[PDB]
A paper describes a structure:
To further understand the contribution of the aliphatic side chain to the interaction between H3K9M and G9a, we performed binding assays with an H3K9-norleucine (H3K9Nle) peptide. We found that H3K9Nle also enhanced binding of the H3 tail peptide to G9a similar to H3K9M (data not shown). We also solved a 1.9Å structure of G9a in complex with an H3K9Nle peptide and SAM. The structure showed that the norleucine side chain adopts a similar orientation as the methionine side chain, with a bend of the end methyl group. When the methionine was substituted with Norleucine, a similar bend of the methyl group was also observed. Such bending increases the diameter of the side chain to enhance van der Waals interactions, therefore explaining the increased binding of H3K9M and H3K9Nle to H3K9 methyltransferases.
However, recent high throughput sequencing analyses identified a high incidence of somatic mutations of critical histone lysines into methionine (K-to-M) in multiple cancers. Other histone K-to-M mutations also dominantly block the methylation of their corresponding lysine residues, suggesting a similar mechanism of function. Moreover, we determined a high-resolution crystal structure of H3K9M in complex with an H3K9 methyltransferase G9a and SAM, which provides a detailed mechanism for the role of methionine in trapping histone methyltransferases. Nonetheless G9a is inhibited by H3K9M in vitro and its SET domain is highly conserved with that of Clr4.
Numbering used by the authors:
A (entry chain A): 921 to 1090, 1095 to 1184
B (entry chain P): 3 to 11
Write the structure that this text describes.
Amino acid sequence: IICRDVARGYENVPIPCVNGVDGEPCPEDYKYISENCETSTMNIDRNITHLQHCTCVDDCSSSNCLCGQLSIRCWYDKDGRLLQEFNKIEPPLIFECNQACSCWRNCKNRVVQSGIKVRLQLYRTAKMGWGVRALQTIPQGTFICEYVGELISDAEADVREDDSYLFDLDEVYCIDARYYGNISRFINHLCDPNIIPVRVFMLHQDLRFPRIAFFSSRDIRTGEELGFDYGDRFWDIKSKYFTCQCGSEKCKHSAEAIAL
Amino acid sequence: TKQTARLST
Ligand SMILES: C[S@@+](CC[C@H](N)C(=O)[O-])C[C@H]1O[C@@H](n2cnc3c(N)ncnc32)[C@H](O)[C@@H]1O
Ligand SMILES: [Zn+2]
Ligand SMILES: [Zn+2]
Ligand SMILES: [Zn+2]
Ligand SMILES: [Zn+2]
Protein backbone atom coordinates (compact mmCIF):
# COMPACT_ATOMS: atom_id res chain seq x y z
CA ILE A 1 0.00 0.00 0.00
CA ILE A 2 3.12 2.12 -0.41
CA CYS A 3 4.65 0.01 -3.19
CA ARG A 4 2.51 -2.53 -5.04
CA ASP A 5 5.44 -4.80 -5.94
CA VAL A 6 9.05 -4.46 -4.86
CA ALA A 7 9.94 -7.28 -7.26
CA ARG A 8 8.72 -5.22 -10.25
CA GLY A 9 6.88 -8.25 -11.68
CA TYR A 10 9.81 -10.68 -11.50
CA GLU A 11 8.18 -13.14 -9.08
CA ASN A 12 5.10 -15.38 -9.56
CA VAL A 13 3.24 -13.09 -7.16
CA PRO A 14 3.55 -9.40 -6.32
CA ILE A 15 5.33 -8.48 -3.08
CA PRO A 16 3.91 -5.21 -1.72
CA CYS A 17 5.66 -2.89 0.75
CA VAL A 18 3.94 -0.96 3.55
CA ASN A 19 5.10 1.22 6.45
CA GLY A 20 2.76 1.79 9.38
CA VAL A 21 5.52 2.49 11.89
CA ASP A 22 7.76 5.42 10.96
CA GLY A 23 8.51 7.78 8.10
CA GLU A 24 11.02 5.68 6.16
CA PRO A 25 10.08 5.28 2.48
CA CYS A 26 10.05 1.79 0.96
CA PRO A 27 13.69 0.79 0.41
CA GLU A 28 15.49 1.52 -2.86
CA ASP A 29 19.21 1.33 -2.02
CA TYR A 30 19.58 -2.06 -3.70
CA LYS A 31 18.85 -3.79 -6.98
CA TYR A 32 15.98 -6.31 -6.80
CA ILE A 33 16.84 -9.48 -8.68
CA SER A 34 14.87 -12.70 -8.69
CA GLU A 35 17.83 -15.03 -9.41
CA ASN A 36 21.47 -15.06 -8.25
CA CYS A 37 23.91 -12.89 -10.24
CA GLU A 38 27.65 -12.92 -10.87
CA THR A 39 30.07 -9.99 -10.76
CA SER A 40 33.28 -11.88 -11.47
CA THR A 41 34.50 -15.09 -13.13
CA MET A 42 32.75 -18.00 -11.41
CA ASN A 43 32.29 -20.63 -14.14
CA ILE A 44 29.45 -22.55 -12.56
CA ASP A 45 29.47 -26.08 -13.95
CA ARG A 46 26.36 -26.20 -16.19
CA ASN A 47 27.50 -29.18 -18.25
CA ILE A 48 24.24 -31.05 -18.91
CA THR A 49 26.20 -34.31 -19.27
CA HIS A 50 27.46 -33.80 -15.70
CA LEU A 51 23.96 -33.78 -14.21
CA GLN A 52 22.78 -36.75 -12.20
CA HIS A 53 19.21 -37.34 -13.34
CA CYS A 54 16.38 -39.85 -13.14
CA THR A 55 14.65 -42.03 -15.70
CA CYS A 56 11.13 -41.82 -14.19
CA VAL A 57 8.14 -41.67 -16.52
CA ASP A 58 5.74 -41.23 -13.61
CA ASP A 59 5.53 -38.11 -11.41
CA CYS A 60 8.68 -39.03 -9.44
CA SER A 61 6.72 -40.11 -6.36
CA SER A 62 8.39 -43.54 -6.29
CA SER A 63 11.44 -44.42 -4.18
CA ASN A 64 13.24 -45.53 -7.38
CA CYS A 65 13.65 -41.91 -8.48
CA LEU A 66 17.42 -41.31 -8.47
CA CYS A 67 16.99 -37.63 -7.75
CA GLY A 68 15.04 -38.51 -4.63
CA GLN A 69 17.73 -41.00 -3.67
CA LEU A 70 20.47 -38.34 -3.90
CA SER A 71 18.37 -36.45 -1.35
CA ILE A 72 18.22 -39.64 0.77
CA ARG A 73 14.56 -39.57 -0.31
CA CYS A 74 12.35 -36.93 -1.90
CA TRP A 75 11.17 -34.85 1.05
CA TYR A 76 8.21 -33.23 -0.72
CA ASP A 77 4.66 -34.47 -0.15
CA LYS A 78 1.92 -34.40 -2.78
CA ASP A 79 1.38 -30.69 -2.12
CA GLY A 80 5.07 -29.78 -2.32
CA ARG A 81 5.59 -29.34 1.42
CA LEU A 82 8.44 -30.89 3.42
CA LEU A 83 7.54 -34.09 5.29
CA GLN A 84 6.97 -33.57 9.03
CA GLU A 85 9.89 -35.87 9.81
CA PHE A 86 12.27 -33.72 7.74
CA ASN A 87 15.44 -32.91 9.68
CA LYS A 88 14.91 -29.23 10.52
CA ILE A 89 18.05 -28.92 12.65
CA GLU A 90 20.52 -30.50 10.23
CA PRO A 91 18.90 -30.46 6.75
CA PRO A 92 19.96 -32.87 4.00
CA LEU A 93 21.07 -31.61 0.59
CA ILE A 94 18.11 -31.54 -1.78
CA PHE A 95 18.48 -32.52 -5.42
CA GLU A 96 15.47 -31.49 -7.44
CA CYS A 97 14.78 -32.91 -10.90
CA ASN A 98 16.33 -31.07 -13.80
CA GLN A 99 16.48 -30.67 -17.57
CA ALA A 100 18.35 -33.98 -18.06
CA CYS A 101 15.66 -36.01 -16.24
CA SER A 102 13.13 -38.04 -18.25
CA CYS A 103 10.23 -36.75 -16.13
CA TRP A 104 7.85 -33.88 -16.94
CA ARG A 105 8.13 -30.32 -15.59
CA ASN A 106 5.16 -31.00 -13.28
CA CYS A 107 6.74 -33.95 -11.42
CA LYS A 108 6.72 -33.95 -7.60
CA ASN A 109 10.39 -33.09 -7.18
CA ARG A 110 10.51 -29.51 -8.47
CA VAL A 111 9.25 -27.30 -5.64
CA VAL A 112 11.98 -24.66 -5.29
CA GLN A 113 12.54 -24.26 -9.03
CA SER A 114 8.87 -23.32 -9.45
CA GLY A 115 9.34 -20.16 -7.35
CA ILE A 116 7.31 -18.17 -4.82
CA LYS A 117 3.69 -19.23 -4.28
CA VAL A 118 2.67 -17.63 -0.98
CA ARG A 119 1.57 -14.05 -0.37
CA LEU A 120 4.25 -12.09 1.45
CA GLN A 121 4.68 -8.48 2.44
CA LEU A 122 7.65 -6.22 3.07
CA TYR A 123 6.77 -4.13 6.12
CA ARG A 124 8.33 -1.84 8.66
CA THR A 125 8.96 -3.50 12.02
CA ALA A 126 8.99 -1.78 15.38
CA LYS A 127 12.63 -2.47 16.23
CA MET A 128 14.50 -4.35 13.47
CA GLY A 129 14.00 -2.05 10.48
CA TRP A 130 12.30 -3.71 7.51
CA GLY A 131 11.08 -7.28 7.75
CA VAL A 132 8.93 -9.79 5.92
CA ARG A 133 5.57 -11.17 7.01
CA ALA A 134 2.93 -13.54 5.64
CA LEU A 135 -0.33 -12.30 4.15
CA GLN A 136 -1.82 -15.78 4.51
CA THR A 137 -1.77 -18.99 6.51
CA ILE A 138 1.37 -20.97 5.68
CA PRO A 139 1.38 -24.63 6.77
CA GLN A 140 4.58 -26.22 8.09
CA GLY A 141 6.91 -27.43 5.30
CA THR A 142 5.89 -24.84 2.70
CA PHE A 143 8.47 -23.33 0.35
CA ILE A 144 8.64 -19.56 1.03
CA CYS A 145 11.40 -17.99 -1.04
CA GLU A 146 15.05 -18.31 -2.02
CA TYR A 147 17.95 -16.30 -0.52
CA VAL A 148 19.04 -14.55 -3.68
CA GLY A 149 21.87 -12.16 -4.46
CA GLU A 150 25.45 -11.63 -5.58
CA LEU A 151 27.67 -14.73 -5.72
CA ILE A 152 31.15 -13.87 -4.37
CA SER A 153 34.21 -15.71 -3.07
CA ASP A 154 34.96 -16.32 0.60
CA ALA A 155 37.89 -13.90 0.17
CA GLU A 156 35.67 -11.20 -1.34
CA ALA A 157 32.98 -11.54 1.30
CA ASP A 158 35.53 -10.95 3.99
CA VAL A 159 36.52 -7.50 2.71
CA ARG A 160 32.92 -6.44 2.19
CA GLU A 161 32.28 -3.26 4.20
CA ASP A 162 28.59 -4.09 4.73
CA ASP A 163 28.31 -7.55 6.23
CA SER A 164 24.60 -7.51 7.06
CA TYR A 165 23.48 -9.61 4.03
CA LEU A 166 26.14 -12.31 3.61
CA PHE A 167 25.07 -15.95 3.41
CA ASP A 168 27.77 -18.66 3.42
CA LEU A 169 26.96 -21.49 1.01
CA ASP A 170 29.01 -24.12 2.89
CA GLU A 171 37.21 -22.72 0.30
CA VAL A 172 33.54 -21.73 0.13
CA TYR A 173 31.39 -19.17 -1.65
CA CYS A 174 28.91 -16.59 -0.38
CA ILE A 175 25.71 -14.84 -1.39
CA ASP A 176 25.82 -11.09 -0.72
CA ALA A 177 22.35 -9.64 -0.99
CA ARG A 178 23.47 -6.08 -0.06
CA TYR A 179 23.65 -4.54 -3.53
CA TYR A 180 21.67 -7.17 -5.42
CA GLY A 181 18.96 -9.21 -3.70
CA ASN A 182 15.37 -10.45 -3.55
CA ILE A 183 12.70 -10.32 -0.80
CA SER A 184 14.82 -12.64 1.37
CA ARG A 185 17.36 -9.87 2.05
CA PHE A 186 14.65 -8.38 4.25
CA ILE A 187 14.01 -11.42 6.46
CA ASN A 188 15.15 -10.78 10.03
CA HIS A 189 16.81 -12.98 12.64
CA LEU A 190 14.56 -14.69 15.16
CA CYS A 191 15.80 -16.71 18.13
CA ASP A 192 12.48 -18.56 17.89
CA PRO A 193 12.47 -19.00 14.08
CA ASN A 194 9.54 -20.11 11.93
CA ILE A 195 11.54 -20.78 8.73
CA ILE A 196 14.71 -22.74 7.92
CA PRO A 197 17.23 -22.41 5.07
CA VAL A 198 17.92 -25.51 2.99
CA ARG A 199 20.60 -26.11 0.36
CA VAL A 200 19.06 -27.15 -2.95
CA PHE A 201 20.32 -28.10 -6.39
CA MET A 202 18.24 -27.64 -9.52
CA LEU A 203 19.52 -26.73 -13.00
CA HIS A 204 23.13 -27.44 -12.07
CA GLN A 205 24.88 -29.65 -9.53
CA ASP A 206 28.04 -27.61 -8.99
CA LEU A 207 28.52 -28.30 -5.26
CA ARG A 208 30.21 -24.94 -4.71
CA PHE A 209 26.86 -23.30 -5.37
CA PRO A 210 23.89 -24.71 -3.50
CA ARG A 211 20.88 -22.42 -3.67
CA ILE A 212 19.34 -21.42 -0.40
CA ALA A 213 15.67 -22.22 0.05
CA PHE A 214 13.51 -21.14 3.00
CA PHE A 215 10.76 -23.50 4.18
CA SER A 216 8.34 -22.88 7.08
CA SER A 217 9.44 -24.93 10.11
CA ARG A 218 5.93 -24.76 11.60
CA ASP A 219 2.47 -23.45 10.74
CA ILE A 220 2.55 -19.67 10.28
CA ARG A 221 -0.37 -17.31 10.98
CA THR A 222 -1.42 -14.49 8.68
CA GLY A 223 0.54 -11.37 9.70
CA GLU A 224 3.35 -13.18 11.50
CA GLU A 225 6.88 -11.99 10.77
CA LEU A 226 9.07 -14.56 9.02
CA GLY A 227 12.51 -15.18 10.44
CA PHE A 228 15.30 -17.70 10.70
CA ASP A 229 18.20 -18.23 13.06
CA TYR A 230 21.08 -16.44 11.32
CA GLY A 231 23.55 -18.47 13.39
CA ASP A 232 26.72 -17.80 15.39
CA ARG A 233 28.88 -17.08 12.32
CA PHE A 234 26.75 -13.93 12.11
CA TRP A 235 26.23 -12.94 15.73
CA ASP A 236 29.79 -13.64 16.96
CA ILE A 237 30.85 -10.69 14.83
CA LYS A 238 27.68 -8.61 14.77
CA SER A 239 26.82 -8.63 18.48
CA LYS A 240 29.74 -6.27 19.09
CA TYR A 241 27.81 -3.66 17.08
CA PHE A 242 24.20 -4.39 18.02
CA THR A 243 22.05 -6.80 20.00
CA CYS A 244 19.02 -8.95 19.21
CA GLN A 245 15.56 -7.37 19.37
CA CYS A 246 13.52 -10.51 18.63
CA GLY A 247 12.01 -10.17 22.09
CA SER A 248 11.72 -13.90 22.65
CA GLU A 249 12.04 -15.29 26.16
CA LYS A 250 14.56 -17.71 24.64
CA CYS A 251 16.59 -14.93 23.03
CA LYS A 252 20.27 -15.80 22.82
CA HIS A 253 21.69 -12.50 21.63
CA SER A 254 19.90 -9.74 23.55
CA ALA A 255 21.74 -6.96 25.35
CA GLU A 256 20.71 -8.77 28.54
CA ALA A 257 21.63 -12.36 27.55
CA ILE A 258 25.09 -11.20 26.47
CA ALA A 259 25.46 -9.49 29.85
CA LEU A 260 24.04 -12.46 31.77
CA THR B 1 36.86 -17.34 12.35
CA LYS B 2 36.25 -14.78 9.60
CA GLN B 3 36.44 -10.97 9.46
CA THR B 4 32.83 -10.46 8.27
CA ALA B 5 29.44 -11.66 9.55
CA ARG B 6 28.01 -14.67 7.69
CA LEU B 7 24.50 -16.12 7.91
CA SER B 8 24.58 -19.94 7.66
CA THR B 9 22.59 -23.21 7.35
C1 LIG C 1 19.44 -9.59 6.22
S1 LIG C 1 19.20 -7.97 6.99
C2 LIG C 1 17.45 -8.05 7.45
C3 LIG C 1 16.68 -6.85 6.89
C4 LIG C 1 16.88 -5.56 7.68
N1 LIG C 1 16.02 -5.53 8.86
C5 LIG C 1 16.66 -4.33 6.81
O1 LIG C 1 15.88 -3.44 7.18
O2 LIG C 1 17.25 -4.21 5.73
C6 LIG C 1 20.05 -8.23 8.57
C7 LIG C 1 20.09 -6.94 9.38
O3 LIG C 1 18.81 -6.63 9.89
C8 LIG C 1 18.91 -6.28 11.25
N2 LIG C 1 18.36 -7.38 12.05
C9 LIG C 1 17.98 -8.61 11.58
N3 LIG C 1 17.55 -9.35 12.63
C10 LIG C 1 17.67 -8.61 13.76
C11 LIG C 1 17.38 -8.88 15.09
N4 LIG C 1 16.88 -10.06 15.45
N5 LIG C 1 17.62 -7.91 16.05
C12 LIG C 1 18.14 -6.69 15.68
N6 LIG C 1 18.42 -6.43 14.35
C13 LIG C 1 18.18 -7.37 13.41
C14 LIG C 1 20.39 -6.15 11.56
O4 LIG C 1 20.79 -4.84 11.24
C15 LIG C 1 21.02 -7.08 10.56
O5 LIG C 1 22.34 -6.70 10.23
ZN1 LIG D 1 12.37 -39.10 -10.92
ZN1 LIG E 1 14.88 -36.40 -11.65
ZN1 LIG F 1 11.13 -35.63 -11.76
ZN1 LIG G 1 16.73 -12.86 19.85
